[PDB]
Structure 1
Amino acid sequence: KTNERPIIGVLAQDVFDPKPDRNSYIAASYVKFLESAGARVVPVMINKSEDEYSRLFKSINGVLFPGGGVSLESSGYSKAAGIFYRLALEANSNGDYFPVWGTCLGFELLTLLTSGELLLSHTNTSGIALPLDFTEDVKGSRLFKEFPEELMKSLATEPLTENSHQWSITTENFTANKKLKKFYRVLSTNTDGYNKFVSTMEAYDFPIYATQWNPEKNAFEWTRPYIPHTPSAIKTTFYMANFFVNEARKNLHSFASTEEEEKALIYNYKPEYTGIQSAFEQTYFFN
């Protein structure tokens, strides 16, 4: 038994200088990422009631906490992410499979959510393309099980992952945090040459997955010299997304009606061209 019309939530994030109709935003590249692996998408608004969130939670099939630069502590983004985090834990312990995906800022957010602490250090990683230095524990993993061996071989030797983060969590900080060490299997590391950090991870016991890098960018973003656009990079964003959506398909939630569905989908919104100015070709702004 499965759900082959999977619908996935994407978290909006506080506009730095809000104005009506600019309160939150989602980079269109996160939408393309999930659509391309066969999902439909719901933008999750920011300053909402516990209960609207739960409703929404009960309706969708997975969440993605996307990259960015807003507060991990005081932002709307961080509130909603927390609420989705615990709802997802509960539901999963109740046989109700619900996956969470954290990209960049979302990865960081998850280290905070599960550790109860802010463990970040500065890295020289604000715009660089990097292989993955895979761990022993990779042959175990879920995330990569279905990747062509040849793609795995490329991700290890070729600059295919986009890093655009000011912050990271080092190997030592991670390994030394008791809550993290037992919650997350670490699938990959990288280094800027000084600090060594966690680049990809996945919960031992939960469908929670996170990358410090931005998979979405390879296929869908074209604004910076350091975005990977080789044939293996494009295959990277596909297989990455394909796994998370293949995870959402195990979830069996669905909306109360279908008039509710149609009213909540990304189709309902129009992005703007923001590619001359920002790192994103296209962005959805919300009230």
Structure 2
Amino acid sequence: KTNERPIIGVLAQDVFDPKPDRNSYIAASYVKFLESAGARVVPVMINKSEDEYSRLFKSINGVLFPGGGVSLESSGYSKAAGIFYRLALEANSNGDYFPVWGTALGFELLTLLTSGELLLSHTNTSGIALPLDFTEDVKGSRLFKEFPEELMKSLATEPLTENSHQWSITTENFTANKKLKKFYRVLSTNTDGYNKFVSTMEAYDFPIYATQWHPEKNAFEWTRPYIPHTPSAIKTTFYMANFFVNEARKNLHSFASTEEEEKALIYNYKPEYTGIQSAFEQTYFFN
């Protein structure tokens, strides 16, 4: 039994200098990321109650934690992500399949949510494109199981992944942490020349996937000269999202009514053109 109309949540995050109708945002490339693989998208708002998130959680089929620059500890974003993370562990544990994806900031958050500790250190990775240095465990992985061979070889040898993060979790800090070592299979690592860090990982026992890099940029962001845009960079963004949405199709939650489904969808919101200056071509702002 499969859900061919998956709806996935994307978490909004705190705007730095917030105003009314401008309290949180979502970069449109994360919306496009998921839509292209045949999902619809609901924005998850920031300063809501446990019950409101619980109602939405039970309605949607997966959730993505996007990149950005807010606090992993004290932000509306971190708090809402922690609520989704416990709900997802509950559901999966009970036997309902519910996938979670973390990108950049979202990857960092997951290391903090699962280990209890802030384990991040500085890496020179603020706007650089890298290949993936796959680990010994990529072989039987879930994430990359459905990628073409030629694409796997291009990922290993071509600079296909966009990194814009001032922090990483070194492989040394990761491996020294008992909780993370047991919880997550590391699929790729990378180096800035000085420190080797985790770049792609998936939970052993849960459908939880995370990248330190930004798969959604290659097809959808054109603002910066280090964003990969070769043909295999484009297929990378499709195959990454294809895997995740195929995860969401294993989840059978639905909204109570088509009416409530219709009001929650991203189609209710119009993004602003931010690409003349911002790293993001388009950005959704929310009250």
The normalised TM-score by structure 2 is: 1.00
- Deviation of the 1:230 alpha carbon: 0.1
Distance in structure 2 (CA, Å) of the matches to 1:4 and 1:243:
14
Distance in structure 2 (CA, Å) of the matches to 1:41 and 1:233:
23
Distance in structure 2 (CA, Å) of the matches to 1:69 and 1:168:
13
Name the residue aligned to 2:132.
132
- Local SS of the residue matching 1:5: coil
- Deviation of the 1:163 alpha carbon: 0.3
Give CA deviations for 1:52-93 in whole Å, capped at 9, x if unaligned.
Answer: 000000000000000000000000000000000000000001
- Deviation of the 1:272 alpha carbon: 0.4
Name the residue aligned to 1:162.
162
- Deviation of the 1:146 alpha carbon: 0.3
- Local SS of the residue matching 2:58: helix
Structure 1 residues 190-269: aligned runs within 5 Å: 190-269=190-269
- Deviation of the 1:277 alpha carbon: 1.3
Distance in structure 1 (CA, Å) of the matches to 2:101 and 2:82:
13
Structure 1 residues 107-122: aligned runs within 5 Å: 107-122=107-122
- Deviation of the 1:169 alpha carbon: 0.2
Distance in structure 2 (CA, Å) of the matches to 1:267 and 1:102:
23
Give CA deviations for 1:189-240 in whole Å, capped at 9, x if unaligned.
Answer: 0000000000000000000000000000000000001000000000000000
- Deviation of the 1:3 alpha carbon: 0.1
Distance in structure 2 (CA, Å) of the matches to 1:38 and 1:135:
30
Distance in structure 1 (CA, Å) of the matches to 2:271 and 2:285:
7
- Local SS of the residue matching 2:143: coil
Give CA deviations for 1:218-264 in whole Å, capped at 9, x if unaligned.
Answer: 00000001000000000000000000000000000000001000000
Structure 1 residues 19-98: aligned runs within 5 Å: 19-98=19-98
Give CA deviations for 1:119-155 in whole Å, capped at 9, x if unaligned.
Answer: 0000000000000000000001000000000000000
- Deviation of the 1:284 alpha carbon: 0.2
Distance in structure 2 (CA, Å) of the matches to 1:85 and 1:171:
23
- Local SS of the residue matching 1:186: strand
Distance in structure 2 (CA, Å) of the matches to 1:104 and 1:244:
16
Distance in structure 2 (CA, Å) of the matches to 1:229 and 1:60:
31
Distance in structure 1 (CA, Å) of the matches to 2:166 and 2:135:
23
- Local SS of the residue matching 1:59: coil
- Deviation of the 1:186 alpha carbon: 0.2
Flag structure 1 segments of 5+ consecutive residues without an equivalent. Answer: none
Give CA deviations for 1:154-188 in whole Å, capped at 9, x if unaligned.
Answer: 00000000000000000000000000000000000
- Deviation of the 1:97 alpha carbon: 0.1
Name the residue aligned to 1:15.
15
Distance in structure 2 (CA, Å) of the matches to 1:192 and 1:136:
20
- Deviation of the 1:266 alpha carbon: 0.2
Distance in structure 1 (CA, Å) of the matches to 2:214 and 2:109:
15
- Local SS of the residue matching 1:2: coil
Distance in structure 2 (CA, Å) of the matches to 1:224 and 1:99:
31
Distance in structure 1 (CA, Å) of the matches to 2:18 and 2:154:
42
Runs of 4+ in structure 1 over 2 Å off: none
Distance in structure 2 (CA, Å) of the matches to 1:149 and 1:262:
39
- Local SS of the residue matching 1:32: helix
Count residues with an aligned counterpart: 287
- Deviation of the 1:26 alpha carbon: 0.1
Name the residue aligned to 1:5.
5
Give CA deviations for 1:255-287 in whole Å, capped at 9, x if unaligned.
Answer: 000100000000000000000110000000000
- Local SS of the residue matching 2:95: coil
